[PDB]
Amino acid sequence: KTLLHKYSDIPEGTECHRKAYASTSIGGATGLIVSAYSIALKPPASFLEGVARTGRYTFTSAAIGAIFGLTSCISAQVREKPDDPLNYFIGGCAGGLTLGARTRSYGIGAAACAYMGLTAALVKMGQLEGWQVFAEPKV
Amino acid sequence: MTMYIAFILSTIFVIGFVGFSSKPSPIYGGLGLIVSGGVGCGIVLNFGGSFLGLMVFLIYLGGMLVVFGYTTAMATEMYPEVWVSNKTVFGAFVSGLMMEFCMVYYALKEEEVEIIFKFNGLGDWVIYDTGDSGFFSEEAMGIAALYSYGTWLVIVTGWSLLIGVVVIMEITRGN
Amino acid sequence: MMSGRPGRVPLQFLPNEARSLPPPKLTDPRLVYMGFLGYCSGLIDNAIRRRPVVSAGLHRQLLYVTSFVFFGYYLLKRQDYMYALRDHDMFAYVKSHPEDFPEKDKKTYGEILEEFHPVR
Amino acid sequence: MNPIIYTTLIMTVMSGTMLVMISSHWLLIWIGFEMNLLAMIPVLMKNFNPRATEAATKYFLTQATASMMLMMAIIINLLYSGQWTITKMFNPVAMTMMTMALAMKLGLSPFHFWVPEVTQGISLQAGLLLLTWQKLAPLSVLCQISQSINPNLMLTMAMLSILIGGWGGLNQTQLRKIMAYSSIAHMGWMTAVLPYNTTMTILNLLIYITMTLAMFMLLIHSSATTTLSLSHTWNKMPVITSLMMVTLLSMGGLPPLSGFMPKWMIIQEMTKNESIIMPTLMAMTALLNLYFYMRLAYSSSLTMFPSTNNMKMKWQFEHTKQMKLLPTMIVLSTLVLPMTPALSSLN
Amino acid sequence: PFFDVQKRLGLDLDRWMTIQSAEQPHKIPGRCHAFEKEWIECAHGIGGIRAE
Amino acid sequence: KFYIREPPHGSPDWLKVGLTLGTSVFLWIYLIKQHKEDVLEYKRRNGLE
Amino acid sequence: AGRIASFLKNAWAKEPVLVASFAIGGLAIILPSLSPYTNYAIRINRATPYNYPVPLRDDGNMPDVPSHPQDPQGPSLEWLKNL
Amino acid sequence: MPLVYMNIIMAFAIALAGLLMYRSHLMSSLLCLEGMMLSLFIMSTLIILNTHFTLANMMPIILLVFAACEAALGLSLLVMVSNTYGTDYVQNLNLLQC
Amino acid sequence: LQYGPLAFVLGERTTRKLTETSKVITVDGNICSGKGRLAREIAEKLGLRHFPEAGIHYADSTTGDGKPLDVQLSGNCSLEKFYDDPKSNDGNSYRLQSWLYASRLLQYADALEHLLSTGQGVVLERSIYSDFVFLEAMYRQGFIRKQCVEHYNEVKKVTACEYLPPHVVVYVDVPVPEIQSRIQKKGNPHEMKITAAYLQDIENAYKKTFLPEMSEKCEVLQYSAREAEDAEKVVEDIEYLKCDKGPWPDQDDRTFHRLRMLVQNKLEVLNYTTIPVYLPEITIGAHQSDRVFQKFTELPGRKYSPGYNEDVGDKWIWLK
Amino acid sequence: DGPEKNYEKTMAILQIEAEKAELRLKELEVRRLMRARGDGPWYQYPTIDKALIDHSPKTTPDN
Ligand SMILES: CCCCCCCCCCCCCCCCCC(=O)OC[C@H](COP(=O)(O)OCCN)OC(=O)CCCCCCCCCCCCCCCCC
Ligand SMILES: CCCCCCCCCCCCCCCCCC(=O)OC[C@H](COP(=O)(O)OCCN)OC(=O)CCCCCCCCCCCCCCCCC
Ligand SMILES: CCCCCCCCCCCCCCCCCC(=O)O[C@@H](COC(=O)CCCCCCCCCCCCCCC)COP(=O)(O)OC[C@H](O)CO
Ligand SMILES: Nc1nc2c(ncn2[C@@H]2O[C@H](COP(=O)(O)OP(=O)(O)OP(=O)(O)O)[C@@H](O)[C@H]2O)c(=O)[nH]1
Decide: D287 in ligand 3 pocket, CB within 6 A: no
Give the Cα-Cα-Cα angle C45, C47, C53 (nearest 5 degrees).
95
Q: Which residues of E touch H46 (CB under 8 A)?
A: none
- D256: preceding bond cis by omega (within 30 degrees): yes
Question: For residue F19, how far is the Cα from the chain centroid?
Answer: 9
Closest among I111, I108, I104, I105 to I49, alpha carbons compared: I111
SS3 content of chain A, % helix, strand, coil (to 5): 80, 0, 20
> Using CA atoms, how far apart are residues A33 and A55, in angstroms rounded to an integer?
13
Interface residue of D316, D322, D324 to substitute, partner I, most I CBs within 10 Å: D316
> Using CA atoms, how far apart are residues I133 and I153, in angstroms rounded to an integer?
11
DSSP code of residue I29:
E
> Using CA atoms, how far apart are residues E36 and D90, in angstroms rounded to an integer?
14
Q: Which residues of J touch C98 (CB under 8 A)?
A: none
> Using CA atoms, how far apart are residues I144 and I94, in angstroms rounded to an integer?
7
| Cβ pairs bridging E and J (under 8 Å) | 68
Helix D3-20 × helix D26-44 angle, to 10°: 150
Ligand having the closest approach to the CA of I195? 4
Give residue A64 CA to ligand 1 midpoint distance, Å.
8
Give residues with Cβ within 8 angstroms of I122, minimum separation 6: I23, I24, I25, I48, I49, I51, I111, I112, I114, I115
Interface residue of B135, B138, B141, B148 to substitute, partner G, most G CBs within 10 Å: B135
> Using CA atoms, how far apart are residues G71 and G65, in angstroms rounded to an integer?
9
Q: Are the beta carbons of J59 and G51 separated by less than 8 Å?
A: yes
Nearest atom (ligand 3) to Cα of D285: 40
What CA–CA distances, in Å, run from B68 to D64, H72, H80, I183? Answer: 17, 10, 15, 70
Query: Is I32 within any annotated ligand binding site?
Result: yes
Decide: I84 in ligand 4 pocket, CB within 6 A: no
Give residues with Cβ within 8 angstroms of I105, minimum separation 6: I128, I159, I160, I269, I270, I273
> Using CA atoms, how far apart are residues B60 and G46, in angstroms rounded to an integer?
36
Question: For residue F26, how far is the Cα from the chain centroid?
Answer: 4
What element of type H or E holds I125? strand I122-125
> Using CA atoms, how far apart are residues H56 and E16, in angstroms rounded to an integer?
10
Q: Which of residues 302-321 of D touch I (CB under 8 A)?
A: 304-321
Give the Cα-Cα-Cα angle I39, I42, I44 (nearest 5 degrees).
105
In single-letter form, the type of residue at position G45 comes to N
Number of H helices, E strands in chain F: 1, 0
> Using CA atoms, how far apart are residues H46 and A55, in angstroms rounded to an integer?
46
Whether chain C has a CB inside 8 Å of the CB on I293: the answer is: no
**E26 → chain G, closest CA residue:** G51
Ligand having the closest approach to the CA of I124? 4
In single-letter form, the type of residue at position G43 comes to R
Helix D238-252 × helix D277-297 angle, to 10°: 170
Residue I59 region, left (φ>0) first, then alpha (ψ -120 to 50), else beta?
A: alpha
Give residue I96 CA to ligand 4 midpoint distance, Å.
12
Give the Cα-Cα-Cα angle D109, D112, D118 (nearest 5 degrees).
165
Q: Are the beta carbons of A137 and D272 separated by less than 8 Å?
A: no
What CA–CA distances, in Å, run from B7 to B15, C12, C100, D54? Answer: 12, 54, 57, 42
Q: Between β-strands B112-113 and B119-120, what pairing exists: parallel, antiparallel or unpaired?
A: antiparallel
The burial of I5, by beta-carbon neighbours within 10 Å (0-12 exposed, 13-18 middle, 19 or more buried), is given as middle
Whether chain D has a CB inside 8 Å of the CB on B172: the answer is: no
CA distance D152 to chain A (A): 6
| Domains in chain H with CATH codes | 3-92 (1.10.287.3510)
Q: Which of residues 3-62 of H touch B (CB under 8 A)?
A: 3-11, 14-15, 17-19, 21-25, 27-32, 34-35, 38-39, 41-42, 45-46, 49-50, 52, 54-58, 60-62
Give the Cα-Cα-Cα angle J21, J24, J26 (nearest 5 degrees).
110
What element of type H or E holds A74? helix A47-79
> Using CA atoms, how far apart are residues H89 and H82, in angstroms rounded to an integer?
8
Residue C114 region, left (φ>0) first, then alpha (ψ -120 to 50), else beta?
A: beta
> Using CA atoms, how far apart are residues I298 and I283, in angstroms rounded to an integer?
23
Query: Is I83 within any annotated ligand binding site?
Result: yes
**D341 → chain C, closest CA residue:** C79
By alpha-carbon position, which residue is closest to atom 17 of ligand 1?
Answer: A61
What element of type H or E holds C68? helix C58-96
Name the experimental technique: cryo-EM
- DSSP calls for H78-93: HHHHHHHHSS-BTTT-
Query: Is I125 within any annotated ligand binding site?
Result: yes
Residue I301 · residue F2 · CB < 8 Å: yes
DSSP bridge partners of D307: I284
Residue E25 · residue E37 · CB < 8 Å: no
Experimental resolution (Å)? 3.6
Helices (H), chain G: 2-14, 16-28, 31-34, 38-46, 78-82
The contacts found for A96-101 with CB under 8 angstroms, 24 or more apart, are A97/A67, A98/A60, A98/A63, A98/A64, A98/A67, A99/A60, A99/A63, A99/A64
Question: For residue C90, how far is the Cα from the chain centroid?
Answer: 17
By alpha-carbon position, which residue is closest to atom 3 of ligand 3?
Answer: D284
By alpha-carbon position, which residue is closest to atom 24 of ligand 2?
Answer: D239
Using only C-alpha atoms, what is the Rg of chain D?
Answer: 20
DSSP bridge partners of B2: none
Residue I183 · residue I31 · CB < 8 Å: yes
What distance separates the 2 farthest-apart alpha carbons in chain J?
Answer: 89
Class of the CATH domain delimited by B5-173: mainly alpha
Whether chain C has a CB inside 8 Å of the CB on I197: the answer is: no
Q: Which of residues 30-59 of J touch G (CB under 8 A)?
A: 57, 59
Instruction: Please provide the size of chain A in residues.
Output: 139
Give the Cα-Cα-Cα angle B104, B109, B114 (nearest 5 degrees).
65
Strands (DSSP E) found in chain D: 307-308
> Using CA atoms, how far apart are residues A138 and I64, in angstroms rounded to an integer?
68
Give the Cα-Cα-Cα angle A13, A16, A22 (nearest 5 degrees).
110
The three-class DSSP label of residue E23 is coil
Q: Are the beta carbons of E18 and D24 separated by less than 8 Å?
A: yes
The three-class DSSP label of residue I304 is coil
> Using CA atoms, how far apart are residues I221 and I173, in angstroms rounded to an integer?
11
Backbone angles phi, psi at I56, to 5 degrees: -65, -30
What CA–CA distances, in Å, run from H53 to D31, D77, E30, H58, H79? Answer: 20, 15, 5, 10, 41
Q: Which residues of D touch B117 (CB under 8 A)?
A: 76, 93
Instruction: Give the CA-trace dihedral at D241, D246, D247, D252, to 10 degrees.
Output: 120
Give residues with Cβ within 8 angstroms of I276, minimum separation 6: D226, D228, D229, D231, D232, D308
Facing residue for J29 by CB, picked from C1, C3, C101 = C101
Closest among I113, I107, I110, I106 to I3, alpha carbons compared: I113
